[model samples]
Target: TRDQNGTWEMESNENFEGYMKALDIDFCTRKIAVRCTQTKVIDQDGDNFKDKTTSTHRNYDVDFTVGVEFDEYTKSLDNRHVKALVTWEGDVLVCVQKGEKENRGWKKWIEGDKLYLELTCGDQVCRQVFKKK
Candidate 1:
């Protein structure tokens, strides 16, 4: 079964630059972000979920209950405000960020000791896979 309550270290990401570009993120910040190692901590309580992604240069956190919508500030990621709603499809947790950019949201799924995160913006979709720590 896919469990969602643990720490995960990022293994690798594909096309992170393209996704950052779609967010209008500057090259200077993107350059630093791409080289930094990231760790994701997720806590799941029944249908409630809270997550934090920590890196050397930046961090992001969001807490929400399944089936509810709440405002989210992207902080350093894109500096965008969004209405984030979370839901679960079987073992997969899916989020939809509704706002200015049509290219938004992410999907989190666990496979073995690996957690896969897929981020989308514009026509680009970036995927980051992490291993449980």
Candidate 2:
């Protein structure tokens, strides 16, 4: 089985500014966010999961169970309220966030020693790759 239950350090980020722009993030926040290095701490216990994104500027924590929908408030990131659902699509863990933004969601998967994350908002998509620590 693919394992994503470890600390991952960001290797690279692509078009994160565009993703933030799609979310209507401010210039100051985007500038700061784009420069900061991010780390992901993921924990999985059967159907339940905990995913945390940490950075020097901000941190976002998410807790959810597969196939279950819940309300999620993206505080420091977008400050938006959304109904979020996570599901397993083969080896990939996909999340669909329904809210004001169209086509907003993220996908996570593991590949070798790297964890891949793709974040989407509107027409913009951000790709971030992380190495397991």
Candidate 3:
């Protein structure tokens, strides 16, 4: 089942600065973001979903339907406008963002009591793991 319908606490983050650099994020923001504790809250109902990424420094929220494309503004992250599409690959939820950046997207999956997120931009990949709360 692809049921990721709960709050998750960040356990660890790796190479987030590289991911931010690939997106051309400024030095100040990257420094702040890399050190913040992040929490993920997901609300899923059928094919529609709401995802919230929160931290003391910033927060990002998005709503989308699986297989449906929508215009997305990465306001706090990269501040880029892109066409985003999300789909399920087995139990994994994957998103592709089409815009100025190449190879930009993210994939999320759940394993036991842990959730894994992989954020990508260009050739950089940042992996974050979260434990169910």
Candidate 4:
């Protein structure tokens, strides 16, 4: 889906920018990134969800259940494979990605008019902020 190259910033990124910066992503990627809009289409029924993202740069896709086990491929993330899970921590949506990388995952939450996300990978943890327009 669009977040492939981190196109998520295009949606409501005022909250998640920090996570991207901490990833040590180059300026060229960030420059071309934050401005690139991402379209996320989510199909939810029962406990399953199919999330799809599309952007000018690339695409990202994933499928998961509320408490079921699944595998995800974060294409932009070095094509590393990981087992993933989705759960809720209060009003926030939390994700756990386990693989060769340690403490790797992302969390999403919304407050008032803003969206917040915390991205983690190995010893590095980054957070970002965004808004829905």
Judged by lDDT, which candidate is best? 3
What is the alpha-carbon lDDT of model 4 when measured against the actual structure?
0.77
Better structure of 1 and 4 per TM-score: 1
- Sorted by lDDT (best first), the order is 3, 2, 1, 4
> Count of backbone clashes for each model?
0, 0, 0, 18
lDDT of 4 at 116: 94
Off by over 4 Å in 1: 1-55
Q: TM-score, each model?
A: 0.58, 0.58, 0.58, 0.56
Query: Per-model C-alpha lDDT, please?
Result: 0.90, 0.91, 0.92, 0.77
**Model 3 C-alpha lDDT per residue in residues 31-115, reported as the tens digit of each score:** 8888788899999998888999888545678989999999999877778999999999999999999999999999999999999
Q: Which lDDT tens digits does candidate 2 get at residues 10-74? A: 97999998999999999988988887788999998877789998886556778889999999999
Task: Find the 10 residues in a row with the least total lDDT in model 4.
Answer: 1-10
Look at candidate 1 and tell me the lDDT of residue 3. 67
Worst 10 residues of 3 by lDDT: 54-63
Could you give candidate 1's per-residue lDDT for residues 48-106 as a string of tens digits? 88899987654677778999999999985888899999899999899999999996999
**How accurate locally is residue 127 in candidate 4, as Cα lDDT from 0 to 100?**
87
